Amino acid sequence: SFSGYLKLTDNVYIKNADIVEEAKKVKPTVVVNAANVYLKHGGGVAGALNKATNNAMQVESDDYIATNGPLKVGGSCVLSGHNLAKHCLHVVGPNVNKGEDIQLLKSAYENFNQHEVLLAPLLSAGIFGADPIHSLRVCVDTVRTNVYLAVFDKNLYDKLVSSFL
């Protein structure tokens, strides 16, 4: 199962880890992708997860968008986890760099409550432009299911743990 995580709350755990490497090691039931509404997995966590699937995630995602149209900011869809997990929960956090409402971050995290346990990144962090300390706070105040957070950046991980209220 999950190893090396620091327990933050009853249900939230955190580790300084590459979520692709973590998914390949654990092969969890659900890995969360930091998706955009178009499921265009170009960069950040989405680009890394997609590259690990040899682009199979993108091919599957393009078929999903052709059939269903784009997701909503704050929304999600369940697709295959390919070689990384049983399923991938593609969750769209607001992209502050695209001028999207930060209030949608709580709605984005609510998608995690439909899954008993998940391996996930901090939503709207990184190239999505939100403050990762705020994202962690929304995560622990919104998610009630067991979430194992992988934070790629060591310096950010230390700052998140050291400032956790």
Side-chain angles (χ1 to χ4, degrees):
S1 65
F2 293 97
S3 74
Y5 284 79
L6 174 71
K7 183 166 181 65
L8 294 179
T9 71
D10 175 58
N11 63 298
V12 180
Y13 297 82
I14 193 166
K15 184 183 175 178
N16 173 38
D18 176 332
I19 194 172
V20 170
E21 292 307 309
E22 193 69 7
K24 290 173 168 189
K25 174 168 56 183
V26 170
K27 284 167 206 161
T29 305
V30 178
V31 65
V32 173
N33 179 33
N36 52 54
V37 299
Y38 306 108
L39 302 183
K40 283 305 188 209
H41 312 305
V45 167
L49 291 176
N50 178 57
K51 179 180 176 188
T53 73
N54 183 41
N55 210 52
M57 176 182 287
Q58 190 65 65
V59 167
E60 176 198 30
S61 296
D62 289 348
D63 169 81
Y64 172 91
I65 298 290
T67 296
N68 299 286
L71 277 69
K72 290 169 190 192
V73 174
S76 74
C77 71
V78 177
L79 290 174
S80 177
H82 301 275
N83 59 315
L84 301 173
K86 168 69 154 304
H87 300 296
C88 178
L89 179 69
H90 295 273
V91 180
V92 186
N95 188 324
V96 171
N97 296 323
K98 294 176 178 176
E100 298 165 353
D101 188 10
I102 195 53
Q103 304 185 335
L104 292 164
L105 187 53
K106 187 173 185 73
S107 302
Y109 272 115
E110 289 171 341
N111 294 286
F112 285 29
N113 291 321
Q114 301 293 318
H115 301 280
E116 287 187 352
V117 58
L118 314 89
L119 167 62
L122 284 170
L123 299 180
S124 298
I127 69 172
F128 280 61
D131 179 358
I133 295 181
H134 175 59
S135 187
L136 178 55
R137 178 48 46 198
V138 177
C139 179
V140 309
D141 291 350
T142 307
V143 183
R144 296 177 304 281
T145 57
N146 297 321
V147 59
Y148 289 82
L149 298 167
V151 178
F152 180 59
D153 198 274
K154 182 256 194 197
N155 291 319
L156 174 57
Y157 169 81
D158 289 346
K159 182 170 149 64
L160 286 163
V161 171
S162 77
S163 63
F164 186 66
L165 290 97

